[model samples]
Structure formats: C-alpha cells, structure tokens
Target: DYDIPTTENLYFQGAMGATTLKMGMQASVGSVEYNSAKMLADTLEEMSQGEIKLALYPSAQLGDDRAMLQCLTLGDLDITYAEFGRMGLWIPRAEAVMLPYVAKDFDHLRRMFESDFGQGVRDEMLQKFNWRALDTWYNGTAETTSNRPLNSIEDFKGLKLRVPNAKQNLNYAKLSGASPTPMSFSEVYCALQTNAVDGQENPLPTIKTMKFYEVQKNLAMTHHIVNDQMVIISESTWQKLSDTDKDIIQKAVQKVGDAHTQTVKTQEAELVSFFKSEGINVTYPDLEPFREAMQPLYKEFDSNIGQPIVSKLAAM
Candidate 1:
C-alpha cells in the first residue's frame, strides 16, 4: 500500500515553497564581489534550509551599477553592490563618504558606518529610495599610478589624471591642480598606453588586475580615499520576508562581508611589493599636503551634508 502525503509526513523536506532572490554586480569573476556573492548564496541556502536562495548575475550581465540600481527600484532585481559616490547620484548627501580623507582608514570607516550618521543615511535610503544597505564591504584604498613620479603635491600639477565620472573624484583631481578627465574603467589601460592620460588613481588591486602597472612607470601611495561598497537589497523584496528569514540574511551578509574585507586588505598589503618586483617605481609621498589640499573641498562638503555630520566624520 502507498503512504499518504501530508504536511506532517513531508516536514523533513524543508522549505517546500522556497523563494529565489536575484543579485547583480559589475565585478568580474575571481574578484572580491563575485567571491562574496558566491559565499552568500551558499550560506543563505544552508541557513534558511533552502527557504531563501540567491541568484547571482556578475560582470554586468544585467547592466552597469546605475542600471541595476534602477532595476532594483522597479522590482526587476533584488540586490546589487554600489559605491557611495554612485549612490550619491540619487542621494547627494551619500556622496559625503567619498570626500577626500574623510575616513582615515578601514577601522575608522567601519566605525563611521555604525555611528549615528551612517544609520541616518541607511534609514534615508529605505525611506526615500526603497533600498536598504545591509552592510558595507571594503574594496581597497585608492592610490595613484602615473607615467611620471608623484613625490609631492607639486608633481600632480598639470598632470592629466583619469578619474571616475564622479563629482568627488573629479573635484579632488581639480583641487590637487591636475586636469581631471572623467573616463570609463574599461578604457583606462588604452588611455594610459596611448598617453591620452598622464595617470590614474584606483585601488592597488585594480591597478594590478587591469595591468595598468605595465604601462605606468610610477606608483604613489596616495591612500587618498578608502573605497566602500554597500551590499544593498530592495525594500520590496525585504518586506515579503518573515522576521526569521530577515535575520538569516543579515547574518549571512555580515559573515560574507567580513571575509571579503579581510581578503581585500591582505591583497593590498602584498601588492606594494608585487609592484616593486614588476619594475614599477614605487614612492611614498607625504600625504600631509594632499590632506591639506582637500580642506577646501571639505568645507564645501560640510555645507552640502551638514557641518555637524562632516565634523563628526572627520573626528572619527
């Protein structure tokens, strides 16, 4: 005789009606974002017993960060990673995080995220844009790679620098006396090779991965900005989840974020020596003047995001 199928009999099947969440990112395979997504998918499935699953779309398959963010708002995508500067396009105040020398280091940056100001920003995102930033992931500290040596602020004068098409970076370049040329990341290598741009600034890991070192002669330890990527989810997707599922996702994201941060920090530390070995002239310029140059920009940012918040962030 065949056994009857009932709820009690099928209890061990676990999460019979599972929900799949889609996540998109521009990071290519083997990069930090891709690795973090893979880990999160595994951890979420395991923790929720398959009740929640993550579908990853990496390498901009769906589109760039901006497009994916739009998709999230339309409920066409569930999750994506975005820089504060990119988020600034929608919420101008969020751009405060990208201000030059705002966060002294990674530890300071993490504390700022936990501080009152960070919480307010998160709440604002949820209230205004229907997006929730679950956690902040560290990419790396931005540095300078140039055809000529950059040992001082004066060295940057008249230098044609390739910066991302973000207001903060472009302003930083202008304030430093360099001609800021906004360009897409995909075109950086050829730009450097053809001498279209004198230098570019990015995380050391990026410089190495993009083979920018091959075309660049000097590597400067600018340590100007600490790049932060937010692991964001749509509020629509979030609201459908039960409290238990929400807790599972928050914990999984934190676990994966912590691991990703460690990996990036380790990679950056090892990269300085790697660059030297690759026949690149590495220099440690005095960052004091560079920090000083940003004072004017800080004042402008203070007016933009509130002097109180900017002061607190600087003190932190």
Candidate 2:
C-alpha cells in the first residue's frame, strides 16, 4: 500500500525498498524552518534504511499554510509544520496552546505539551480532524516590533497591528489595546512601509527574516505568547504504516524534532546580539501588565476551547 521511494539509485540503506513522502512547510528558504525540514528528510532517510523516503516542499510549494493543512486533512498531503493557532480552526481545543500568557516560557511550554495535557490535545485532533502530532518544536516567542517604543501596555492604544485571520490572534492584539487588522504575511512589509499598520509581532528570527528591523526600530520582548510549530501527519497515512515502520518513523521524528527545538532555542538566544549589532532597539517590556491584560481571555476562551484542557493546564 505504501508507494516506497523510487529513484532507481538508492545510495543509502533500505535502497532495497523505500517509499518517499512529501512534507510541506511555509517557511521561506534560509530560515530555521527550512533547515529543520532538511534535517528531518535526511535523518529519516538515513534511519529508515531507505525503507522510508522524505521529500520536502518549502516556501509553501504545495500551497499556503492553511491550504497545506487542509490537504493533510484530505490525505492529499503527507506532513507539514504548523502553528497551534492555525490548527485551532478545525480543532478549537488546539487553540489552548496559542492563547496569550498560557505558557511562561520555552521550558514551561515544553512541560505542558509533554504532559498529559499535550497528549489530550493530540488525541482530540486525531479523533476529530485526522491530524496526528508527531512533534511539537519550539518556533519562537512572540514579540512586538514597532517604529515607536512600546514600553508600556498603554502604548498599544490605538495602534494598528497586523495579524492573520485568527480570532485568538485578533483578540491577542485587541486586548493589548491595538486595533487588530487581519493581513496576509506577504503584505506585511509593504503595509508597514505605508503605515497601513503601526507594527506587528513575531519571533525574533521572523523579524530578522522579513527585515522588519529595517522599518521598525523598536522590538518589545513582550514574550506574550510562546509559539510552536508542530510536525503532524494525516490519519490516512499513519494507518497504512506497519507497526515496525511506524516505530522507526516516530523515533526518527522524535530525535530530529528534539534537535530542532534546541536549535531554535539557541538561535533565539543569539538573535538578540545580532539585532543589537544591526542597530535595532530591543526592550524587555514589563510582562505583568501584559499578563494582566490577557487574564480575562482565558475564561472567555475556556468554553470554546475545551474546558477540560483549559482546566488541566490551570490545575497543572
């Protein structure tokens, strides 16, 4: 049933029989996402003895992030790296991870996702949306990038912030006192240049990639949200793998996935120095006020986002 890798020339083990699987990612080339994609493809190829083959589609070759996710749902796509906010569209419970202030930091986030709470969320998706979480890798912490200093929460008042069309994300900006405007990621650069939006928030690496640093001089390390991109596969594909093959694939994914997480953590640490050298202002804004502002959101989101999971997180 598996369409093993067919290249006629198998230089690696499992050249005996290998099935190639296509994995999609929206990250632009040269970003850590791209590097991790290559890591997964190569590591899986080596470990599976060519029994399993992996091909990577970066820059959203298949489609945009949402489109790729839908492709996974329909079993047309094999795998993809996606943020929890995007996955929340189908499995609202998945939104728990994206909600502001839910995670204290990377370590806290790792613990939460590695705990039963994480498995519960995964099970919910697999049961309802046919999406299986292979690994949850830390992407970066969400920070505000602005032309003017956002040293205080009040500074967000009346400012326009670019956000994807996600309700939680919109609320994230709104609660911070900014006017949330849904815009495509590609349009952000021009939008900022034209003052269509006052500023935007993303991880440091993303800010560096899009060169938001050029237009926006201030970076507020609000760290409001701990974001992550997960490696997920469709149920249709998982169901076809034999038990042993599944074990091999899962182990490889776990190993490579952990390595990618550490890589991201390291890059995030190194980025501050780079941004400073590049002449961008970086500030660690007081998170207490930001945390206070986001407090009520939990209750509002709890009901729609599976209270069971919400309560589990709180109880933990």
Candidate 3:
C-alpha cells in the first residue's frame, strides 16, 4: 500500500503473504532499481511467500531529499535508500564520510566505521533525528571534470567547483584552493551549460545520469573518494515498522547494496569507455596534491566531528 508493486506480487505475496513495501531511489531502471526491487521482493518471498507489494519511484520523482523528508513526516512514503550526504542540513556529522580521502575499500570503511567516530554520527542521527542509519551503497567512486585535466594543484588554482551544500564538502572546496559554490543537483546542468561553475564532482552513475557529456568536455579519474550509501527512511517511518519488518529491511538493504556496489565497482572501466565514446576526454592525475590540499580540512573535520567519534570508527 505504501508504493505500488507489480501485479505478479511474486515476491511479497508469495512470501510475506500480505505485506507491501514501498521504495524510492535514484537508480537506473535495470540497474540498482531492479536489484533493490528484487531484494525486497525476494526477501518477503523467501521468508513467507507473502503477497509482497511494491511501488517504485525513480529519478527522485517522489521528490528530492528535502521533499522525501516531508513525505516521511506525513507517512506518505516508507523507505528511501537515496543519496544522503547532502542531508548535511539536518546531520552535519554524516558528511564526515565524504572527506577528501577516508579509505579506499569497503572493508577499510567498515572496519574504520565500527569505531565510535565511525558510527558516532549515525548513532547521533538515531538519537537526534529519529532516522535509522543503514549500510551505504557505494554507487561509484568520484572523478574530476572540467575543460582540461586536473593534473596538478595549480590546475585547480582558481577553478570554481560546484558542489552540494553540505558544509563539510564546502571545507574541501576551500581547502583545495578552488572556490566552492553550493548548488542543487538539478541546477548542475544549467550551471555547466552557462559555465556558471568550472567543474563538479560525482560518481559515474551520476555523471552519466545527468548526461554530463553534453556539458563538460573532460573527466579525470581522480577517484578522489569512494561514495557509499543510499540513505533510507527517517526514524518516524522506521518506528512504525514491526521488528520483523525491520529485520527484513536490514537484510534486504545489505543484499541490494552489495549487489549494486559490486556491479558499479566492476563496471568502473566502462566509465572511461563511455566517456570516450561520447567524445569526452578522460585523464588520470597524481591524487597526491589534491590529497595534501585536503589534509587540514580533514584535521578540522575530525575535530569538528570530534576525535572520540573517529576513535570508535577506527576500531570498526
């Protein structure tokens, strides 16, 4: 009843029997979307063969992150593993995950995150916002884009980089010497079209989704930071679920997240492949300069998020 599921209901109906699940994501139809959809469908099917019902909304049609918050407030929606780093407006600490360079692989992230600092903000999120913290969906790694290669620190000398409004991310822009401008995801196209901003950063799926090929001429595989997680429901909706339902969701989230992440990671080369095919030049650079540029920023963030939180995360 939350969102609409396919008629076969082969997943929920046959398994969970009568329960329906609603989901929203920024996934491409046959990629993350289908994988996540089936995660829930099969979750119920395997557990109870309940007539599982599902309704899917893609490309943020249900609303951007802000609107999704409202929908959850009104109980108009149920779950979203949507990109959440920008939700910094509500949880400043979460952006710590997006620091210039946290870790290269998921295992490192998981291990580091188990430390208090790693999971601290997530714990705070539950305590303060009543939102649940689920596993991250490593959509793809980040790369630099502009008219030319971001080969050296000087290349970013005066570049104006467009970025989400998350404060922590802003710190990165400034630290990196480029001017940081907070912009919405929707406005990026226009920002690029008019040269309002020199460049932007995001994972492959995002660059591809927005068809950046038409706006930006070059992409550098900086792979600056590994992006993870599609944030799901706020605590309000989460509280309404039965414990069993919560368990199912937790398991399903990890399952789908794993599939999507691995799928994206394995297909990373296609990013360059596609870029070249679209006539965009792709480049590689020494990430050392950019990483060095961000050291102070990271120190400040560690202090801001607090060292205790970091300590806990490192333990993980």
- Tell me how many clashing residue pairs each candidate has: 0, 7, 34
Q: Score every model by TM-score.
A: 0.89, 0.85, 0.74
Query: Of the pair 1 and 3, which is ahead by TM-score?
Result: 1
CA lDDT of 267 in candidate 2?
A: 85
- On lDDT, who's better, 1 or 3? 1
- Runs of candidate 3 exceeding 4 Å displacement: 1-17, 26-35, 59-63, 67-76, 82-91, 164-169, 181-197, 230-248, 277-279, 304-316
Candidates sorted on lDDT, descending: 1, 2, 3
lDDT of each: 0.86, 0.79, 0.67
Candidate 3 lands at a TM-score of 0.74
Tens-digit lDDT track of model 2 for 232-307: 9888888888898788879888888788888988888898888888888888878888777887888777765546
lDDT against true structure, model 1: 0.86
| TM-score, cand. 2 vs. native | 0.85
Pairs clashing within candidate 1? none
Highest-scoring model, lDDT = 1
